[PDB]
């Protein structure tokens, strides 16, 4: 299985990462690693890893899909089915 993996590479500003993707977030509805990454000119594996570590970290709210391999990113205004 000849997966990214991006370890070291690029030491670029992390904090802009970690703000695009919360700029993002609110900006793009859903985006893909592969856009993502090219958004924050990383790549999906650390576009895929550090958005994972921004909903663990609390930094960003939802899920990842790995059945699409799509990032789920919170909107405004939003809550989801009627509660009761």
Same mark, same amino acid.
């Given at each position: 299985?000849?997966?990214?993996?991006?370890?070291?590479?690029?030491?670029?500003?992390?904090? #802009?990462?970690? %703000? &695009? /993707?919360?700029?993002?977030?609110? /900006?793009?509805? &859903?985006?893909?690693?592969?856009?993502?990454?090219? /958004?924050?000119?990383?790549?999906?594996?650390?576009?895929?890893?550090?958005?994972?570590?921004?909903?663990?970290? *609390?930094?960003? &709210? *939802?899920?990842?899909?790995?059945?699409?391999?799509? #990032? %789920?990113?919170?909107?405004?205004?939003?809550?989801?089915?009627?509660?009761?």
């Amino acid at each position: 299985g000849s997966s990214g993996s991006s370890g070291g590479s690029s030491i670029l500003d992390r904090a #802009v990462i970690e %703000h &695009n /993707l919360l700029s993002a977030s609110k /900006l793009y509805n &859903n985006i893909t690693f592969e856009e993502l990454g090219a /958004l924050l000119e990383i790549p999906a594996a650390k576009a895929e890893k550090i958005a994972s570590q921004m909903i663990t970290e *609390g930094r960003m &709210n *939802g899920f990842i899909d790995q059945i699409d391999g799509i #990032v %789920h990113f919170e909107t405004r205004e939003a809550s989801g089915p009627s509660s009761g």
